[PDB]
Paper text:
In Gram-negative bacteria eﬄux pumps are multimers of three different proteins that form a long transmembrane scaffold linking the cytoplasm to the outside of the cell. These tripartite assemblies are composed of an inner membrane protein from the RND (Resistance Nodulation cell Division) family, which corresponds to the pumping motor that uses the proton-gradient as an energy source; an outer membrane channel from the OMF (Outer Membrane Factor) family; and a periplasmic protein from the MFP (membrane fusion protein) family, anchored to the inner membrane and connecting the other two proteins. In P. aeruginosa, up to 12 different pumps have been sequenced, including OprMOMF-MexAMFP-MexBRND which is one of the most studied pumps because of its constitutive expression whereas the others appear under antibiotic pressure. This study will focus on the versatile membrane channel OprM, which has the ability to work with at least four different pumps, including OprM-MexAB, OprM-MexXY, OprM-MexJK, and OprM-MexMN. The architecture of OprM is composed of a beta-barrel domain that is ∼40 Å in height spanning the outer membrane and a periplasmic alpha-helical domain that is ∼100 Å in length and bears a central buoy. In this study, we have shown that OprM is palmitylated at its N-terminal cysteine by thio-palmitoylation.
To investigate the lipoyl structure, we decided to solve the structure of the best diffracting dataset limited to 3.8 Å resolution. The here-solved structure comprises two trimers in the asymmetric unit with the second trimer being poorly defined. The crystal packing of our C2 OprM structure is slightly different from the P212121 structure but they share common type I crystal packing in which the homo-trimer channels interact in a head-to-head manner through the hydrophobic beta-barrel domains mimicking a lipid bilayer plane. In contrast, when stabilized by a more packed environment around the N-terminus, the entire fatty acid chain appears in the density map of the C2 form where two different orientations are observed. For the three N-termini, the main chain is stabilized by hydrogen bonds with R133 and the carboxyl group of L128. In each case, the palmitoyl tail then turns around two hydrophobic residues, L128 and F129. The palmitoyl from the B monomer (subsequently called Palm-B) is located near the Palm-C of a symmetrical molecule but not close enough to form van der Waals contact because the distance between them is greater than 7 Å. Interestingly, Palm-A instead makes short van der Waals contacts with its own symmetric structure, justifying the quality of the electron density map for this region even at low resolution. The quality of the electron density for this particular monomer makes us confident about the exact nature of the fatty acid modification of OprM.
Author numbering:
A (entry chain A), B (entry chain C), C (entry chain B): 1 to 457
Amino acid sequence: CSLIPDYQRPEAPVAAAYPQGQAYGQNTGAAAVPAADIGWREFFRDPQLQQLIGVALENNRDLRVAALNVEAFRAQYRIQRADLFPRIGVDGSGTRQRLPGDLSTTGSPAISSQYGVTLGTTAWELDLFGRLRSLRDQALEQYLATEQAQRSAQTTLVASVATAYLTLKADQAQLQLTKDTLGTYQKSFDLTQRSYDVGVASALDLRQAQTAVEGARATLAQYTRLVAQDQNALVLLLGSGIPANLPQGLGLDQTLLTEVPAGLPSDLLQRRPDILEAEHQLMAANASIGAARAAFFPSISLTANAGTMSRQLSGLFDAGSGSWLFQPSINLPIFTAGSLRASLDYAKIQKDINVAQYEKAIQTAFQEVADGLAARGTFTEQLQAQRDLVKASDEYYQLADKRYRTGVDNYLTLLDAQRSLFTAQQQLITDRLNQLTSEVNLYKALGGGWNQQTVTQ
Amino acid sequence: CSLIPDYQRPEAPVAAAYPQGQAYGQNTGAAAVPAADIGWREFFRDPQLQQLIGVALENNRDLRVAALNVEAFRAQYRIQRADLFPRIGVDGSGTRQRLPGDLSTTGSPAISSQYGVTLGTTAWELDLFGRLRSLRDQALEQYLATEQAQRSAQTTLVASVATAYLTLKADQAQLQLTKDTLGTYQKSFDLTQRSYDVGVASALDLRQAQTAVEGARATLAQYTRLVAQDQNALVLLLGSGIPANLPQGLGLDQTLLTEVPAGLPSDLLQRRPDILEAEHQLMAANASIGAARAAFFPSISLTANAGTMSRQLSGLFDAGSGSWLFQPSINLPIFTAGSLRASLDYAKIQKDINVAQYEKAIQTAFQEVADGLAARGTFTEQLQAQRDLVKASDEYYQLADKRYRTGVDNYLTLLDAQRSLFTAQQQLITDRLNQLTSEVNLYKALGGGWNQQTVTQ
Amino acid sequence: CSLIPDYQRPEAPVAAAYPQGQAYGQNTGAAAVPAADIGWREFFRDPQLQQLIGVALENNRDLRVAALNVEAFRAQYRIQRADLFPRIGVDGSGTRQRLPGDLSTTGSPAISSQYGVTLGTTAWELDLFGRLRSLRDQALEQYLATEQAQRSAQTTLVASVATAYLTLKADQAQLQLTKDTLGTYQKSFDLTQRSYDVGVASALDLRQAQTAVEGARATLAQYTRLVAQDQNALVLLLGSGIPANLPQGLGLDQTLLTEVPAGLPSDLLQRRPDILEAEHQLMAANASIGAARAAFFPSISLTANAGTMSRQLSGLFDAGSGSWLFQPSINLPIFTAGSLRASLDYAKIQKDINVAQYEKAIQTAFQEVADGLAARGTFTEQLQAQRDLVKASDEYYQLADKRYRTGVDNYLTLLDAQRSLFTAQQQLITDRLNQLTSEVNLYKALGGGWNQQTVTQ
Ligand SMILES: *C(=O)CCCCCCCCCCCCCCC
Ligand SMILES: *C(=O)CCCCCCCCCCCCCCC
Ligand SMILES: *C(=O)CCCCCCCCCCCCCCC
């Protein structure tokens, strides 16, 4: 006999297929390679970055923690498994009481004494109904589930390292742009100086020029700080100072990652890490019902051993001192104040809770992937659209640039051209990044990179 | 006896009445209707949204979770309650040992044997001092508390759903604004294209006219994305794909809720969910001192049973095999290494912790409501004040619109009109939301939606 | 014996010294006083704020909690100490059974009875291999750790309060700047009203002049709200409404704190709080291996007591009734299905996990200080460079101010002067703050304020 019920994974309560239209590309359908099976070494192309992932994996503690965390639950599974088996031991015991008149067999105050040394168990429970096999399962699951959770955690170390490198490099490009426009700003302000002591530039076109230059001298220092902060942001996730012998790193403008299929939603149910932890996490608690159930049932204890006894010590390892005990026991509950029903329910409930929980994780995937397909299905278009506000403004730069020094126009159109452009340059870089984020997190949500390499069928 | 001490709820260590002045309206005083008793189906007027709340209730797993949680702690209370009662059962046991000479009663190796099937309890505790009623109350409390926390949770589900539907609708409204100003922008650029190949529009006035249009073409894509992101944001909290047959949903510009009375601070204590869990939480640990105390006291144990025995199996259910046992026990400790003291302390402290925690939650309510009263007491004012920067800009738009195509002026003052307007438009939508937000959160803070309906004394 | 392994604090896996260069000042080297040893009543110079810290110390509930927690862990340690010691009790027990023929000593149904009242211990474990001592140390450690963590959390209450006071004052300075430029803006608009009903000011120059004043009347209400929100932010951390009798608080422009030495990283290991909790946290589980080891070894039980007994109650405290027992026992397991291996692993692992955690905490310290040194090594320069964009913009304000009313120029170069100035003003305050922030947090990460006073050598 064994009392665990029939696992029956619930039906994923999200839409059968991802929603569409209002920013969503076409639904490619069943993918022949899941993102899950697509290794980040492939999905990331930037090899200097790739080898940063390398270093983060082999170093980041929070992943270590999450790795050991498994070794624990295997160990905890072990301990549970043992309890199917009987605890055998060598054991010596004494006893040496005075009794009173009415008690000693002598009818008068005497002092009994028993000694024994033996090899056997006390109170071994003989799983007939599998109260134990159940428990063993609970912890087996809670183990397996932990395995998953580890996988779940790496994909996130990867993603977060991608991301960090990116805000780092991105902020690096947010910087050099500031260098260029610093030399530019100051050269501009110096040609509105000779031209001032020469009266051609007024004090207004001089103060303006000063607000440009100063407007830059500030966003210099900022994208300096936010460079070091992004650097610090990195070595952490690394667990190692960044090595010197890094490969040649690329630049945001490139094409750094593979475009990844989004498959069906149902796909998740066999591939998204946490969503499996969830499942086993559920499974364990289902076991815990079996365990509960069995407490309604006859438990068969068994004490038993064998060795040598006597009345004084001395005659222990001497002839005939041989002894032994056989002491089985069958017990069965007739009244607890529904204690049993009560803590059977607690367990059934806890199942249900984990059912619910499975369902929450699932329904959170849909969300997190959809957000990334909105993002996929919008960011490209925003990338062309902002690419234009660069050109239009670089021309609307050159033209006003010359037109100011040509007496036709003022400085306010020179200046405002500079805003209308610089803004478009920063926001450009940043837009690039967040398209990247969007894709990296998208990579994750569909199964991320447990795999270094890509694998098939 | 029962050594649980006298609960004496502390005094809510915040200001007596909500602070005033620097952005706070008038303090209406005791409200005849607590926001608490005011049901969201009333406090929300948008019936489409209302019914979304409905769906999010019947569906969200996170609530399911938190709801079961109760049931668990009920069962947990059950389990503790059964402990007052004796654990009764059928029970069979054997024993069958060889003894050595000095130990068998025959003075010579013989083999004893005892068999017994009885119906009784072992070491049942009589609750005299109420160590057990104590635990029972601890568990009852951690249960009741858990009821509260469920209520707390739902209010946050409501609030968060209102909010989602909102930023969703607010980004919907953020969008059509960009449809409009897209057709507007391109119309404008094309009337600065005929006018270009015709020489009336320069190349500058063609490149600015290109950056307005371009600056739009991207804020299109963005508010196209941040719409699917907010959509995705919804079905989650829904736990269900949004049904088709929803009523007619309204628009931010309306008047979607009931203004809510802010009542007195004192009011929180009897109505704001979490602030009760806190209390009961505190109360649970209060009992847990009772418990500790009692282990200083005489504990009464009791083993007792009756049925048949014998010296070989067979003669069990036969005549005279009748047996029984009565075996009472009294224990009173006269030395642990101050164990009982130290472990009493723990539970005392733990009460104190929960007192402190009660106080925390109280003082966090004050804050979170007051923030909503600065919010109430300024958002309307920023709503009129921003309503103006729309009109003044729409005029400073019609004007410069004509004035540019009338050759009096340039394009820079057409463009800057466009900025200084569209800016005020978006900022207006967002300021609408944030006012709303602030009010939903305010609703919550004062006792939120437990009740679908609004109920009287 | 004592099987607790030999603690060996791992080597702090970060860079030997603070990263340098791309925004980092000079690395002053070992500091003669750690930021740790330096007092916040000295590091902070605003004495009004200083007494805000005083207030938030003597009150804040979250720190209280955090403090009680210690006491509880002392208590828990206590209880674990006690187990070295034997559990002594006065104790009474009875027994009264009807046997059947073959079992009664009378060969025919009769009813036995035994009574006793004795002062002793049962099953006291003699700590030989120090399994218990081990545990004692475990809970001692986890206690000591809890001590550190408390200190940890105080530094953070300070930091959070410095902060809230700041963003408070910073938002106040953000406000009066708005009062000023409101009287300014309305004056301006009315001088472009007399001049409008007089023809000199156009209708465009009146709608621009209307969107300035309207852009201000708006940013009034906002910075009015985010001051009551930054107020509510404060009394919370305070745990008390802000006293009337505070001293004279300063203004962001001052020099409110002591610049602090950032010493060697190594210094962290001996001074930054959480990094210690972790260490002890590590040490605790270190002991936990000792404890596990020992279960491989013989355990030595000892039931033992003394008193008076008899066969009927009566002759209890009557002559001869004297009795006693001595009943020692040694046990050594020979087989558990690897249970002891497994549960030894779990404990070994749990050490290694705490190793990992020590390492991660250290590695987050680096990060959080480096960020503060980028910050320290940039904010000064962004402060001079933003100081300039103020002057350049107030000049480029006075100029265009007179120049507009002197007919030479339009209003757009009055308005854009106003933007390019006021924006520089707001962002100037904000920048002041974020520098301050960066510096408070810096002071925290390197030991923060345990000490009100500064101590040395
Ligand atoms: C679930 O009840 C499975 C068993 C029922 C089938 C037949 C009976 C077999 C078990 C009898 C138990 C007695 C022997 C146990 C001694 C240790
Ligand atoms: C706290 O317990 C104070 C009272 C003293 C208790 C001492 C022991 C005597 C109690 C007698 C109770 C009889 C009740 C019978 C059970 C149904
Ligand atoms: C851990 O408990 C290991 C157990 C082994 C202990 C060894 C016992 C040795 C006994 C001799 C001690 C006599 C002391 C005289 C010294 C001069």
